[PDB]
Amino acid sequence: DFHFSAIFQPTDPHHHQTEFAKVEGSEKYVEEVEVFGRQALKVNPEALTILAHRAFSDVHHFFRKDHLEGWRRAIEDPEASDNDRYVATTLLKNACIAAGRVLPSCQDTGTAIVLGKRGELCWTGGEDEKYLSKGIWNAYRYHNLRYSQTAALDMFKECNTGDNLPAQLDLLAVPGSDYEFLFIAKGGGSANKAYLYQETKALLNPKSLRAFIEEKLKTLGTAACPPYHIALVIGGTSAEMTMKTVKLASCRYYDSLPTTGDKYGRAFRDPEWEKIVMEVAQKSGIGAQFGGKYFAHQARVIRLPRHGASCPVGLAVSCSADRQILAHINKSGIYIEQLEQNPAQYLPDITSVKVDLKRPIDKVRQQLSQYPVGTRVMLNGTLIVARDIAHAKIKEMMDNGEPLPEYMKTSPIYYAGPAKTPEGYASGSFGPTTAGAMDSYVDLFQSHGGSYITLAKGNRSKQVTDACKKHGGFYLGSIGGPAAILAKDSIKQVTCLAFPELGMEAVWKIEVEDFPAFIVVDDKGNDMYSKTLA
């Protein structure tokens, strides 16, 4: 009566539907042997370093076809809004710059995540973690990427690790003698939009599930740079299993799962509810960051078994920096997924207010006050750059009696942290970070005569709308994601002004030209997300 049924039963477990390229000459790293009648593969661990290094270089300059097709859909769909088409065109042009292999597609070159599946008879010598980490170290050290990892010296004392390590290394034991991989360069912003809900059987009916989806999609907002790949996982054997599944779903790792359940509790993809998620996303009006139809590229919905007393639910997105690469090592060598090297083919063959920042900031506020939310502006002049740690350090100084520093009162505040500057370039990739993380500082800083104008991406909380109304302030929404084209075209000079020890989180002073943004919050209580994200 016993019948074993694996939870996950992909019809394409080795991802034959994906195109792979062989690393030239890499068969020298493997040797086929036979022990106790069984075929085994000896793998020189240097192969892991070579593979991880190439994966975490290529993935910052190229995208999958299904990602690029989504941007083209947003440009060509008559139902797309004008802002949809503008955002998608910007992101596609950004991808063309990134394909030059100098600037990464986003300034947040992400956390390095490795899912590895080492066969029982795949013999590496056992030091997989170190050799994979050395390849990741190589990719971020010798390329124009960013060191994004923050070490805790104690509970509250932090420092940047200076090399984007440690990585997340999830190495699984599986049958056979090969070594299979999914590499993910996961941005912090989309990582923040991985949510776990503890629900019940009361959710598991069409009316409740639909209302649930409508409610939760709005909590994603625009804070992870849509158009999104939206993943939704209903059920699971534990919270961590549910969240791992929703991560992999967002990477389209589970696309070949069956589409029906059975009495053994196997996982399945649900196309009907994927369509419902897409319908909710499109009808939400949230759009590709600034109102419209293209909140989502596509949806993945996976139904999992559950303990009778439990119903964990996971919701997560892949952002505009959609970065994953499949790979495998076998008797023929090292193979790595082929990404699209000519994104320009997705660009079709076929209006804003000039804002001079080189003025007293009160004159800039006066000009911005003339326009409603949703107005597109082009910024020209100085920005002062500061994000999470710089804001916390400055509040700490003020809590100790010190004044808000003068450099927080002279120019708009750009929430951003740059990637490393290529030789001969004025700036590395340098797009905005998520605005919501700074929300608790705006009222305090504005009441002390600074931060009247902020520039970042993502919808913000009500306290920021109230502060801007109380203090005559503005929040400007940059397009989220196009860090390479912003660096190449808009950022003319970068200098470090304060807190050099914070690395990418230092206070910078930059000079920009033709920097596009939308007025998201004005000085009158208006918010261009108040209807779609209410």
Q: Residue 166, exposed/middle/buried by CB under 10 A (0-12, 13-18, 19+)?
A: middle
Examine residue 278 and tell whether it contacts a copy of itself (CB under 8 A): no
One of 61, 186, 328, 471 touching a copy of itself (CB under 8 A): 186
Examine residue 275 and tell whether it contacts a copy of itself (CB under 8 A): no
Residue 389: which of ligand SF4, a copy of itself, none does it interact with, CB under 5 to 8 A by kind? a copy of itself
Examine residue 112 and tell whether it contacts ligand SF4 (CB under 6 A): no
Examine residue 480 and tell whether it contacts ligand SF4 (CB under 6 A): yes
- CA separation (Å) from 362 to 174, 359, 365, 402, 505? 64, 8, 5, 24, 27
Residue 152: which of a copy of itself, ligand SF4, none does it interact with, CB under 5 to 8 A by kind? a copy of itself
Query: Three-state secondary structure along 430-471?
Result: CCECEHHHHHHHHHHHHHCCCCCEEEEECCCCHHHHHHHHHH
Residue 480: which of ligand SF4, a copy of itself, none does it interact with, CB under 5 to 8 A by kind? ligand SF4
DSSP string, 77-121: -TTS-HHHHHHHHHHHHHHHHHTTSSS-SSS---EEEEEEEEETT
One of 21, 23, 159, 426 touching a copy of itself (CB under 8 A): 159
Please tell me the distance from the alpha carbon of residue 510 to that of residue 382, in angstroms, as a whole number.
6
Q: Which of these ranges, 147-155, 188-196, 418-426, 487-495, lies near ligand SF4 under the rule CB under 6 A?
A: 188-196
Q: Which of these ranges, 165-173, 292-300, 338-346, 463-471, lies near a copy of itself under the rule CB under 8 A?
A: 165-173
One of 56, 86, 228, 268 touching a copy of itself (CB under 8 A): 268
Residue 263: which of ligand SF4, a copy of itself, none does it interact with, CB under 5 to 8 A by kind? a copy of itself
Q: Which of these ranges, 80-88, 256-264, 325-333, 402-410, lies near a copy of itself under the rule CB under 8 A?
A: 256-264
One of 27, 158, 214, 255 touching a copy of itself (CB under 8 A): 158
Residue 175, φ and ψ in degrees, nearest 5: -70, 160
Q: Which is nearer to a copy of itself, 200 or 369 (CB)?
A: 200
Q: Please list every residue from 412 through 451 that binds ligand SF4, using CB under 6 A.
A: 431
Examine residue 504 and tell whether it contacts ligand SF4 (CB under 6 A): no
DSSP lists the bridge partners of residue 516 as 378
Size of the site for a copy of itself (CB under 8 A): 122
322 close to 67: Cβ distance less than 8 angstroms: yes
Tokens of 367: 């000009």
One of 298, 320, 330, 490 touching ligand SF4 (CB under 6 A): 320
380 close to 357: Cβ distance less than 8 angstroms: yes
Tokens of 12: 């394409």
Give me the amino acid identity at 399.
Answer: D
One of 190, 284, 446, 532 touching ligand SF4 (CB under 6 A): 190
Please tell me the distance from the alpha carbon of residue 425 to that of residue 22, in angstroms, as a whole number.
32
In the block, tokens 């209302």 appear at 211
Beta strands in 352-428 (DSSP E): 353-356, 376-385, 413-414
CA triple 345-346-351, angle to 5 deg: 115
Please tell me the distance from the alpha carbon of residue 445 to that of residue 198, in angstroms, as a whole number.
37
Residue 246, φ and ψ in degrees, nearest 5: -70, -35
One of 88, 220, 230, 319 touching ligand SF4 (CB under 6 A): 319
Q: Please list every residue from 439 through 468 that binds a copy of itself, using CB under 8 A.
A: 440-441
Q: Please list every residue from 217 through 256 that binds ligand SF4, using CB under 6 A.
A: 224-225
One of 202, 350, 362, 500 touching a copy of itself (CB under 8 A): 202
Residue 304: which of ligand SF4, a copy of itself, none does it interact with, CB under 5 to 8 A by kind? a copy of itself
Collapsed DSSP state (helix, strand, coil) of residue 279: helix
* H-run or E-run covering 235: strand 228-236
Site map (CB under 8 A) of a copy of itself, residues 126-155, x = contact? xxxxx--xx--x---x------xxxxxxxx
One of 84, 108, 337, 511 touching ligand SF4 (CB under 6 A): 108
Examine residue 311 and tell whether it contacts ligand SF4 (CB under 6 A): no
258 preceded by cis ω (within 30°)? Answer: no
Please tell me the distance from the alpha carbon of residue 191 to that of residue 521, in angstroms, as a whole number.
25
Q: Please list every residue from 39 through 98 that binds a copy of itself, using CB under 8 A.
A: 42
Residue 23, φ and ψ in degrees, nearest 5: -70, 120
Q: Which is nearer to a copy of itself, 205 or 370 (CB)?
A: 205
In the complex, which residue's CB is closest to ligand SF4? 187
Examine residue 523 and tell whether it contacts ligand SF4 (CB under 6 A): no
Residue 237: which of a copy of itself, ligand SF4, none does it interact with, CB under 5 to 8 A by kind? a copy of itself
Collapsed DSSP state (helix, strand, coil) of residue 44: coil
Q: Which is nearer to ligand SF4, 417 or 473 (CB)?
A: 417
In the block, tokens 């389209």 appear at 252
Examine residue 388 and tell whether it contacts ligand SF4 (CB under 6 A): no
Examine residue 435 and tell whether it contacts a copy of itself (CB under 8 A): no
Residue 259, φ and ψ in degrees, nearest 5: -110, 10
CB of 410 to ligand SF4, least distance (A): 26
CB atoms within 10 A of CB 150: 14
Residue 71: which of a copy of itself, ligand SF4, none does it interact with, CB under 5 to 8 A by kind? none
Phi-psi category of residue 195: left, alpha or beta, with phi > 0 → left and psi -120 to 50 → alpha:
beta
Q: Which residues bind ligand SF4 (CB under 6 A)?
A: 106, 108, 187-190, 224-225, 319-321, 431, 480-481
